[PDB]
Scaffold this motif. Structure first.
Motif, PDB file in Angstrom:
ATOM      1  N   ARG B   9      34.594  45.671  55.939  1.00  0.00           N
ATOM      2  CA  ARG B   9      33.455  45.149  55.191  1.00  0.00           C
ATOM      3  C   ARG B   9      32.201  45.120  56.056  1.00  0.00           C
ATOM      4  N   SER B  10      32.337  44.683  57.309  1.00  0.00           N
ATOM      5  CA  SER B  10      31.198  44.668  58.221  1.00  0.00           C
ATOM      6  C   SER B  10      30.697  46.080  58.492  1.00  0.00           C
ATOM      7  N   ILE B  11      31.617  47.035  58.633  1.00  0.00           N
ATOM      8  CA  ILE B  11      31.218  48.420  58.862  1.00  0.00           C
ATOM      9  C   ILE B  11      30.438  48.948  57.666  1.00  0.00           C
ATOM     10  N   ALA B  12      30.909  48.649  56.454  1.00  0.00           N
ATOM     11  CA  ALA B  12      30.176  49.053  55.258  1.00  0.00           C
ATOM     12  C   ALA B  12      28.797  48.409  55.220  1.00  0.00           C
ATOM     13  N   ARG B  13      28.718  47.123  55.567  1.00  0.00           N
ATOM     14  CA  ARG B  13      27.431  46.436  55.592  1.00  0.00           C
ATOM     15  C   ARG B  13      26.472  47.112  56.564  1.00  0.00           C
ATOM     16  N   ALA B  14      26.960  47.445  57.759  1.00  0.00           N
ATOM     17  CA  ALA B  14      26.097  48.047  58.770  1.00  0.00           C
ATOM     18  C   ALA B  14      25.681  49.459  58.379  1.00  0.00           C
ATOM     19  N   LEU B  15      26.586  50.219  57.760  1.00  0.00           N
ATOM     20  CA  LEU B  15      26.341  51.627  57.474  1.00  0.00           C
ATOM     21  C   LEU B  15      25.509  51.854  56.219  1.00  0.00           C
ATOM     22  N   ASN B  16      25.214  50.806  55.450  1.00  0.00           N
ATOM     23  CA  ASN B  16      24.418  50.934  54.230  1.00  0.00           C
ATOM     24  C   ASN B  16      25.158  51.750  53.170  1.00  0.00           C
ATOM     25  N   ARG B  17      26.468  51.540  53.066  1.00  0.00           N
ATOM     26  CA  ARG B  17      27.285  52.168  52.039  1.00  0.00           C
ATOM     27  C   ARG B  17      28.209  51.125  51.427  1.00  0.00           C
ATOM     28  N   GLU B  18      28.562  51.341  50.164  1.00  0.00           N
ATOM     29  CA  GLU B  18      29.375  50.377  49.436  1.00  0.00           C
ATOM     30  C   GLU B  18      30.784  50.305  50.016  1.00  0.00           C
ATOM     31  N   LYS B  56      29.126  52.886  42.402  1.00  0.00           N
ATOM     32  CA  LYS B  56      27.897  53.536  41.963  1.00  0.00           C
ATOM     33  C   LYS B  56      27.388  54.540  42.994  1.00  0.00           C
ATOM     34  N   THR B  57      28.271  55.050  43.852  1.00  0.00           N
ATOM     35  CA  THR B  57      27.871  56.003  44.876  1.00  0.00           C
ATOM     36  C   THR B  57      29.019  56.960  45.156  1.00  0.00           C
ATOM     37  N   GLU B  58      28.666  58.152  45.632  1.00  0.00           N
ATOM     38  CA  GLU B  58      29.642  59.140  46.067  1.00  0.00           C
ATOM     39  C   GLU B  58      29.945  59.052  47.555  1.00  0.00           C
ATOM     40  N   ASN B  59      29.277  58.161  48.284  1.00  0.00           N
ATOM     41  CA  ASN B  59      29.532  57.955  49.710  1.00  0.00           C
ATOM     42  C   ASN B  59      29.715  56.469  50.005  1.00  0.00           C
ATOM     43  N   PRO B  60      30.673  55.817  49.353  1.00  0.00           N
ATOM     44  CA  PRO B  60      31.040  54.451  49.733  1.00  0.00           C
ATOM     45  C   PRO B  60      32.016  54.466  50.906  1.00  0.00           C
ATOM     46  N   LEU B  61      32.475  53.274  51.280  1.00  0.00           N
ATOM     47  CA  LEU B  61      33.439  53.095  52.361  1.00  0.00           C
ATOM     48  C   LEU B  61      34.789  52.757  51.742  1.00  0.00           C
ATOM     49  N   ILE B  62      35.696  53.729  51.740  1.00  0.00           N
ATOM     50  CA  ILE B  62      37.018  53.578  51.145  1.00  0.00           C
ATOM     51  C   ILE B  62      38.009  53.202  52.237  1.00  0.00           C
TER      52      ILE B  62
END
Ligand SMILES: Nc1ncnc2c1ncn2[C@@H]1O[C@H](COP(=O)(O)OP(=O)(O)O)[C@@H](O)[C@H]1O
Lengths: 62, 62
Positions: B9-18, B56-62
């Motif tokens: 979750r923190s990595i997603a927050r930092a990377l600006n991806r869902e 809502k994005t094609e580049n989220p963090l899965i």
């Protein structure tokens, strides 16, 4: 069409679902088994009525 | 209970991806990713499709 207006009653059959819900309604059921039964019924709905897994799920639910 | 989910979750927050998480523990039916052939009633797409839909994005963090 007259039936579609009221004859169908726009009510899902859910014979097994309703039967089990009323069967457990009187019982003081714990919440863990409550959610387990909810998930099992959701899976049963997700499956077909002419497959072995459906019968296994019905047997476990019984 | 080490925070790996929190790390992601923190990595997603930092990377600006869902962010999104998937549970693949003890799973056996690939359908949960492959959904179903959509001709049988009640078919649902795999969890990846839901992740894309909500994120809502094609580049989220899965
Ligand atoms: N180094 C850390 N600093 C602060 N909080 C942490 C740390 N490691 C874990 N946590 C806590 O762990 C929680 C999430 O744990 P979780 O990701 O579920 O563990 P696991 O990945 O083992 O299941 C978060 O609420 C977070 O506050």
């Amino acid at each position: 069409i007259i039936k579609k207006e009221l004859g169908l009653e726009k009510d899902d059959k859910d014979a097994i679902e309703e039967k089990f819900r009323e069967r457990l309604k009187e019982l003081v059921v714990p919440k863990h088994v409550m959610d387990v039964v909810d998930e099992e019924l959701s899976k049963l709905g997700l499956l077909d009525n002419h497959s072995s897994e459906f019968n296994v799920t019905r047997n476990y639910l019984d | 209970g080490v925070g790996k989910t929190s790390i992601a979750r923190s990595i997603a927050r930092a990377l600006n991806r869902e962010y999104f998480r998937f549970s693949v523990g003890g799973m056996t039916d690939v359908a949960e990713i492959k959904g179903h052939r959509r001709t049988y009633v009640g078919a649902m797409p795999g969890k990846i499709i839901q992740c894309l839909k909500k994120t809502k994005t094609e580049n989220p963090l899965i």
